[PDB]
Design a protein around this ligand. Structure first.
Ligand code: PPD
Ligand code: PPD
Lengths: 396, 396
């Protein structure tokens, strides 16, 4: 049965990582992966988390299965975060949330759901996007088209190009949006743009799918959600996939959610049932540990305060590295302006580098960027900035 | 898009559990879900687990992603449990293991893998079997056929009928086998039958897929792997989906493994890469918590000794309930002769009840069995026995 199986192509992200290890060179930097890093170059366990964990150690009396959708408080807490405390969506019992194994698991779950219960055939993602988007949708047997997004020339959002590709999209098509902190560009729309896209969407019959993997990393928890919120204000239906991997430092625990929104309660309920059937035939029910830690923290005022502060620290550290990066770029001879960087959000920055430049950076230099050409500002440290900056100049 | 979605039917297992949850009548017995219960009628957290979770709490320094296949130690440990310390499959490096979200997760990954990289079109499952089997397979696009297994008349394994039905199975078809403790029948094959089953499988070209969800609940860790080991001794290829939900009481942490076995290390490696690609488009990487717990316990002689003892206690409590159940039934007045019970293994027992009897047994007195007429022996206590049997006799 397996003699003729072909090797699978290496994973664009994961693949690069494997090689980072094998590169046995001393002073090699590693800016190519969307995980948070501290001033010391480590990815620690949050203090709020370690606390929520003592608590769970002390208080759990059973490990009996959660329900297919997971921890209820988990669900309410997420919807609050997404939509806001006094949301009508919430008030009208118009949304349902399923706890899933990470942001990926949600996407997948949303994928299977749509493929088997709807007339959906195509999902539109941006160019560029997180490479894994395509594989997940394609796995559900859905088509993935692409929309223009980035302006290679001006290092900004190509609004017209974007609105222009979107016209090849049919009513009933799924359009995927990065909630904030676009991967891998770091370029997000403005509130005004989001509002324009929102009106367009309803005018056109698109089904919005938001990918929210870094809420709290652009401007702050609430700000970062104004986009989603503008859509939710006019859409009857919508889907949201979120992840708590970056914001809670819970990567390996697989904490995310899939929120389904319908015109009304009777509808989401009917629909949510199919979504649950989908989960049942996939992984059955979710992993408790990380979601539990999340609920505990979001529910306890003290823990939650420590957490938001930890989040703020992470976010500020990033903002520090962008400025420091363009600065050192300048003081290092670079004679290209890297100031657009400063206007970018999140961990990712589309530096401007070329496919070859990237190869070079890593071959000669030991500096590992993303295949796509983006760098993870979060892997930069006051210590590694110089060396890293010399190398980039050396290839411009 | 959601307007006409049709509500999903209730799950045969999960659906009853909920039904049982919305009735607070007194002496309400719950025998229809396959979770272990103690004499107190609870599902406790093992002490070995509690011990391991502290260690983790004390040692963990990061929640950074695990690789697609999870924890290495976890894989080796699983393999040794499965095949034996000195297995050739192990020495020849002929097997690769992916850490998955529970046994359902493993099954689903095996399914996607098979569907996308192979000529498999059908999977043969026993009649009856755990109802979720048909669902995971169908979700992956595979078709499922059923082979006879159970002798309603004699409360045994219909070996002839089984073999006789399997004959309709072609070369390249997947035949699903429950490693031990058949669900929901409790009827397992003898070693001699396994051997017969192994040899016929080789010559007919079936691809064996073993579902191993309760290793340790029949006779013991090793003893339980006997059947798996006979096949392994003469197949070039095979797939193993295992669960640590029951045996470690880690139900909600989602701890399982998918083991792939090929003719050699090069083949296994190439197939495995296709497996990892399947995972990556599903949930991406697995939940660390449960698995670390397993790995830690399995690696430590001390924790290990403690863990095996707790398993032994669980197993012996079930054996106790089997005997007490036939005795009480006996006394309480039953007409039928339920000694066959004694010969069954694990948590379940096909009592031999009809569809109506189960309906009645639950509308009438609040005894909740599985639609199939199976009854979870592990949800029986010395307290609830009498009332239980009283209800049962009332319906024969
Ligand atoms: C935009 C985006 N969406 C969804 C996800 C999936 O998140 P979960 O880890 O919660 O599943 C990621 C993670 N992308 C990271 C890491 C990775 O892809 O493995 C990145 O390096 O871009 C992401 O960047
Ligand atoms: C035969 C069998 N295989 C796989 C699984 C899945 O195990 P995981 O929980 O590790 O995914 C179960 C669990 N079956 C239980 C519980 C359930 O079906 O949800 C049962 O009631 O039979 C099972 O009985």
């Amino acid at each position: 049965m397996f003699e003729n199986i072909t090797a699978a192509p290496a994973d664009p992200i994961l693949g690069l990582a494997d090689l980072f290890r094998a590169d046995e060179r001393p002073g090699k930097i590693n800016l190519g992966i969307g995980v948070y890093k501290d001033e010391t170059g480590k990815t620690p366990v949050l203090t709020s988390v370690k606390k929520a964990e003592q608590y769970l150690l002390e208080n759990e009396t059973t490990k009996n299965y959660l329900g297919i959708d997971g921890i209820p408080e988990f669900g309410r807490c997420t919807q609050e975060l997404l939509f806001g405390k006094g949301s009508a969506l919430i008030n009208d019992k118009r949304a349902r949330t399923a706890q899933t194994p990470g942001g990926t698991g949600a996407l997948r779950v949303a994928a299977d759901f749509l493929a088997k219960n709807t007339s959906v055939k195509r999902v539109w993602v941006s160019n560029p996007s997180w490479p894994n988007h395509k594989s997940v949708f394609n796995s559900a047997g859905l088509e993935v088209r692409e929309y223009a997004y980035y302006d290679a020339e001006n290092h900004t959002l190509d609004f017209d190009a974007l609105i222009n590709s979107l016209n090849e999209a049919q009513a009933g098509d799924v359009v995927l949006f990065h909630g904030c902190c676009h991967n891998p560009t770091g370029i997000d729309p403005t509130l005004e743009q989001w509002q324009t896209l929102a009106q367009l969407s309803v005018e056109k019959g698109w089904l919005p799918l938001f990918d929210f993997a870094r809420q709290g990393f652009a401007r702050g928890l609430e700000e970062d959600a104004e986009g989603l919120r503008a859509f939710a204000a006019m859409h009857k239906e919508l889907i949201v996939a979120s992840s708590y991997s970056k914001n809670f430092g819970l990567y390996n625990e697989r904490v995310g959610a899939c929120t389904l929104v319908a015109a009304d309660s009777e509808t989401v309920d009917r629909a949510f049932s199919q979504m649950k059937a989908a989960i049942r035939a996939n992984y059955s029910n979710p992993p408790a540990h990380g979601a539990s830690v999340v609920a505990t923290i979001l529910s306890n005022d003290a823990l939650r305060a420590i957490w938001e502060q930890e989040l703020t620290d992470m976010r500020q550290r990033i903002q520090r590295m962008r400025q420091l990066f363009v600065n050192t770029l300048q003081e290092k001879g670079a004679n290209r302006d890297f100031s657009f960087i400063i206007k970018q959000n999140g961990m990712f920055s589309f530096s401007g580098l070329t496919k070859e430049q990237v190869l070079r950076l890593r071959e000669e230099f030991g500096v590992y960027a993303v295949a796509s050409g983006a760098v993870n500002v979060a892997g930069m440290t006051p210590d590694n900035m110089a060396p890293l900056c010399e190398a980039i100049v050396a290839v411009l």
